[PDB]
Amino acid sequence: GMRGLMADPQGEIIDLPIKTNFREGLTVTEYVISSYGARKGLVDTALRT
């Protein structure tokens, strides 16, 4: 389906969505937006333990 609306590293939802998925392939613009949530989900795991 659709990837959705990702957010900033501070928490602000960007108005530019990611209309593709992991089968169609993301763009270079849609890859750095998805990296904001992957880094946020990574550093929140280490502080959770």
């Binding site: 992991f22 392939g25 763009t27 270079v28 998805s34 992957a38 990574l42």
Partner: protein
């Protein structure tokens, strides 16, 4: 070139960094003024080294050079010039790969990222009140200027200590009342001038001394303020601190770099007052325009600066006690505090790290790491959520994917592919100019230094362009002021030069990166730096094309430089002749030991009589194939669950990977022994050792040392060493046993070097380093023997294997080829992977890789697919399914592609011969073999060594340690009913000198005894609390008796 932050930094130190440190140190004077000492820094020698690059690694030395400067010692009264070259210190040189050799071990210098010097303003709300603006003038070295602004128009200056009024500092530096208000709006400054008095030029130095140093002195107030910001060799803004002052405050003067100008303090107050008038920009601490990086050329400049300051105290303490003349200038300079300053930075500092040399990918990555820790950076406890996240200014400079997971999640970054650091210490990214909707790809890039945020509009390298005409797309997504937007293509300014500009050099080796998740691409980049070099590597079929550039920049690939004709090629050297002393020899290393117990073997590639070009591969490395890099093998894979053998991330391989020497690596271990000097008697290496017969004295050459090429197993003797003893405290049992059969005990004790448990191999280097041979030895040693043992390890059950997409696993079963499933041509299946881990982790690119490598298997073409496309849905699915249709058009291969199920074929079972009910996806996967083998994880202990104080078992595999039963493990047994297991694990297994003897004697005899004694760790705590002044004791509550119990006695 990918290594420019290490080569250009050490080149700047050898011509600009070392000259600037010696020019500021010179000249020096005495207390009276009799003689003066000044150096000539721009004429140093930098003589030849002592040992070779490979010789310094085995001799336990450092590849260093001696530093000599000419020194002119002049005298004030009597005219005399004493010119003499004096030794300064030992400086380790950078090798051809960009590394240093310290004590025989290769080390790197990790680049550390810190804050840039300058003025930074920040809006701060301390409580629910008014808006307060702060300031911070950060220098390169010295004290800080922190200007704050409270409510009701009160601007204060804080110079760690209590704050003070702004008029106290502004008048003590030397100013008038009319020189302040003319360059200031002055109506806001009247509120802070009312409740501050109005001091004169001399009515402010006294009050400044009373609050900083709490009798005031008119001469003490000037010497205190000048030593903080105006004195040389105590306050430095730096070359980049002057650049940031003239940009933020917009100053006209420049090139000061030494003394803080008092006009700059007035400009920082004027920018702070105007922030309340809604004009001016608030700086960001996480912006890369405010964050600098430093390297070996800068970090060595601070170590000689603190090393020459220790030399200044001895040079001034020798020109005052010796009141006589006729003294040599070579005795005034003591090299001992400066030698120990350089040796502390390269061997004892945290930022000089142990180099990872598993494969050439980890060697290239470790020289480009960007860590935020070090002596002057950050702390592991002071790191927060904002410093570990990704800033929007990291686009193309720092890799957002490659970072280690766990504790250092975000603090240790990696440099990107096209990133470059200038002379000021800022990361730059190349960009192509776009003029009227046309990418000008004709000239050199611009290399913007992160100034495209508030001024320029930057498009990434993903937009469809035409052939020099225009841009195809009508809506171009750009980034402007750290926000993404889609504007017209005629309004853009710059465009990226490559789609791999964001990712690093290790993330770029992953094909189909856009189809994988960002969490699994983090793991796929880390597992690629742990792959062992195999015996015969193979190039990938779905490679990205960047493997050829990373192999040449690693330094382990012999390249040509002469454009000549190859004459002689053997397994040790390659001899060519240069043309437009004409016979150069390229040496080839054969099976050299690495830092991570791997091989560094090089193999010849060229033949005799072949034209070469500058930049051609002459001899590839261990983990390098012809030209490109090769870290694994291309073998068949199938995504099907077996009978529980691939249940939870487990790997099922075949027996064909064992006898074909697939995933077979060579590991070379190194052992160490030393014949030290015992004060009872000198130790020597003999062959006739006591209590060892002919079962272990077969490989010795009547010298106590083994020969070359002897197969050693677990429990042998490498070096037979004896040690004299002087105990003479024999028990009465041993005196009666010896008196019967004779055989009186000798005065020596067997201390022979032995092979540890689970270790075997073939001895390849038995190099012995003794005295009177031309090498230096440590004190308290007579003979140093070094043994190198090489072994050939195959792939077994329990080893950790992984791919390029984060699909790690551990092999649990090796099946024969008749039990594995087979393709309809009769070819069996190597790996039977589990398809359940694919859709839960979004590993889609590993399905695109195996389906494309299977198309390249039947064709033999070795595709090179760059990441981050082209037409949508026409570049990944129809590329794979279109090339699989071309492989099915061959008359011999009609079973490769099917019309109903495209990426699937019919697989037959190997045990029963019946086909499966559903078609299975097959393909050629590229798997790697990691360093986490099953041999390094085996540890067991019955009874070994014990601790020094608590008398508990030790911990470690190399010293026969025991497993720790921590506090979370006690809570599980306390939640159980296991009270007797908990008392056994705490008393008879640890910290009891009496209970361990009776428990071990009970098992051998066969009758166990209950009631263990008091543990030793409680009696240590009892004596420690009594030494703190606390009368703590244990009593008995028995009938009419309250007596203290003696737990120790």
């Amino acid at each position: 070139d990918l290594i420019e932050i290490q080569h250009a930094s050490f080149h700047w130190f050898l011509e600009e960094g070392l000259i600037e440190e010696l020019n500021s140190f010179s000249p020096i004077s005495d207390y009276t003024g009799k003689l003066e000492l000044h150096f000539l820094g721009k004429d140093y020698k930098l003589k030849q080294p002592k040992y070779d690059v490979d010789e310094s690694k085995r001799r336990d030395a450092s590849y260093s050079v001696q530093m000599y400067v000419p020194t002119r010692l002049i005298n004030k009264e009597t005219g005399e010039i004493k010119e003499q070259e004096v030794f300064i210190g030992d400086l380790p040189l950078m090798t051809e790969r960009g590394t240093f050799i310290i004590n025989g071990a290769e080390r790197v210098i990790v680049n550390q990222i810190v804050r840039s010097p300058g003025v930074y303003y920040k809006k701060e709300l301390d409580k629910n009140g008014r808006r307060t603006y702060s300031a911070s003038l950060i220098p390169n070295r010295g004290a800080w200027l922190k200007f704050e602004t409270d409510k009701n128009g009160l601007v204060y200056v804080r110079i760690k200590t209590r704050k003070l009024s702004a008029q106290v500092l502004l008048k003590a530096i030397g100013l008038s009342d009319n020189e302040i208000l003319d360059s200031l709006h002055p109506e806001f400054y009247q509120k802070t001038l009312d409740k501050e008095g109005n001091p004169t030029e001399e009515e402010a130095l006294v009050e400044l001394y009373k609050k900083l140093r709490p009798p005031p002195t008119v001469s003490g107030g000037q010497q205190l303020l000048e030593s903080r910001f105006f004195d040389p060799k105590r306050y430095d803004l730096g070359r980049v601190g002057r650049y940031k002052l003239n940009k933020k405050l917009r100053l006209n003067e420049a090139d000061t770099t030494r003394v803080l100008t008092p006009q700059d303090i007035l400009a920082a107050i004027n920018y702070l007052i105007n922030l309340e008038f809604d004009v001016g920009t608030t700086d960001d601490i996480d912006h890369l325009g405010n964050r600098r990086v430093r390297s070996v050329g800068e970090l060595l400049q601070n170590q000689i600066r603190v090393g020459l300051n220790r030399l200044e105290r001895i040079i001034r303490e020798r020109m005052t006690v010796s009141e006589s003349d006729a003294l040599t200038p070579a005795s005034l300079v003591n090299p001992k505090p400066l030698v120990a300053a350089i040796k502390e930075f390269f061997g004892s500092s945290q930022l000089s790290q142990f180099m990872d040399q598993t494969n050439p990918l980890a060697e290239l990555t470790h020289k480009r790491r960007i860590s935020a820790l070090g002596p002057g950076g950050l702390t592991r406890e002071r790191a927060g959520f904002a410093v570990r996240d990704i800033h929007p200014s990291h686009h193309g400079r720092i890799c957002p994917v490659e970072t280690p997971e766990g504790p250092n999640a975000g603090l240790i970054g990696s440099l990107a592919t096209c990133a470059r650091v200038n002379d000021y210490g800022f990361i730059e990214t190349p960009y192509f100019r776009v003029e009227s909707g046309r990418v000008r790809k004709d000239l050199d890039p611009v290399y913007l230094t992160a100034d495209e945020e508030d001024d320029m509009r930057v498009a990434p390298g993903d937009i469809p362009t035409d052939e020099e005409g225009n841009i195809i797309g009508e809506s171009v997504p750009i980034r402007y002021r750290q926000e993404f937007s889609t504007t017209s293509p005629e309004q853009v300014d710059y465009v990226a030069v490559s789609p791999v500009q964001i990712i690093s050099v290790a993330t770029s080796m992953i094909p189909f990166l856009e189809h994988d998740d960002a969490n699994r691409a983090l793991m796929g980049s880390n597992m690629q730096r742990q792959a062992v070099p195999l015996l015969r590597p193979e190039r990938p079929l779905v490679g990205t094309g960047l493997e050829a550039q990373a192999a040449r920049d690693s330094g382990m690939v012999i390249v040509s430089r002469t454009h000549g004709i190859v004459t002689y090629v053997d397994a040790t050297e390659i001899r060519v002749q240069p043309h437009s002393g004409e016979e150069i020899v390229y040496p080839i290393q054969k099976y050299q030991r690495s830092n991570q117990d791997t091989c560094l073997n090089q193999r010849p590639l060229v033949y005799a009589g072949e034209d070469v070009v500058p930049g051609q591969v002459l001899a590839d490395g261990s983990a390098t194939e012809g030209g490109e890099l090769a870290l694994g093998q291309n073998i068949l894979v199938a995504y099907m669950p077996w009978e529980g053998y691939n249940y939870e991330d487990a790997i099922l391989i075949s027996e064909r990977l064992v006898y074909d020497d697939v995933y077979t690596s060579i590991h070379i271990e190194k052992f160490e022994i030393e014949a030290r000097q015992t004060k009872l008697g000198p130790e020597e290496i003999t062959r006739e050792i006591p209590n060892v017969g002919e079962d272990a004295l077969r490989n010795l050459d009547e010298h106590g040392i083994i020969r070359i090429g002897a197969w050693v197993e677990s429990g042998d003797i490498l070096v037979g060493k004896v040690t004299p003893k002087g105990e003479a405290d024999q028990p009465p049992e041993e005196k009666l046993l010896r008196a019967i059969f004779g055989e009186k005990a000798r005065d020596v004790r067997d201390n022979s070097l032995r092979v540890p448990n689970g270790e075997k191999g073939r001895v390849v280097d038995v190099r012995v380093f003794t005295r009177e041979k031309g090498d230096e030895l440590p004190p308290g040693a007579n003979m140093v023997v070094r043994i190198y043992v090489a072994q050939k390890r195959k792939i077994q059950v329990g080893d950790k294997m992984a791919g390029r997409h984060g699909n790690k696993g551990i092999i649990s079963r090796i099946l024969p080829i008749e039990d594995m499933p087979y393709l309809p041509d009769g070819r069996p299946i190597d790996i039977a992977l589990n398809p359940l881990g694919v859709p839960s982790r979004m590993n889609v690119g590993q399905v695109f890789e195996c389906l494309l490598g299977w198309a390249g298997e039947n064709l033999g073409v070795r595709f090179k697919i760059t990441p981050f496309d082209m037409y949508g849905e026409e570049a990944s699915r129809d590329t794979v399914h279109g090339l699989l249709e071309e492989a099915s058009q061959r008359p011999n291969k009609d079973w490769v592609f099917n019309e109903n199920h495209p990426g699937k074929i019919q697989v037959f079972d190997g045990r029963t011969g019946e086909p499966f009910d559903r078609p299975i996806t097959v393909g050629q996967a590229y798997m790697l073999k990691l360093v986490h083998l099953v041999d390094d994880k085996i540890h067991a202990r019955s009874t070994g060594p014990y601790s020094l104080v608590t008398q508990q078992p030790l911990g470690g595999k190399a010293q026969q340690g025991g497993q720790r039963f921590g506090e979370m493990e006690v809570w599980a047994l306390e939640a159980y009913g296991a009270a007797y297991i908990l008392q056994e694990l705490l008393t008879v297994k640890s910290d009891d000198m009496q209970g361990r003897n009776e428990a071990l004697n009970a098992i051998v005899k066969g009758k166990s005894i209950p009631r263990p004694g008091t543990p030793e760790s409680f009696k240590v705590l009892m004596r420690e609390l009594q030494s703190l002044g606390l009368d703590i004791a244990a009593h008995k509550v028995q009938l009419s008796e309250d007596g203290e119990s003696a737990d120790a006695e």
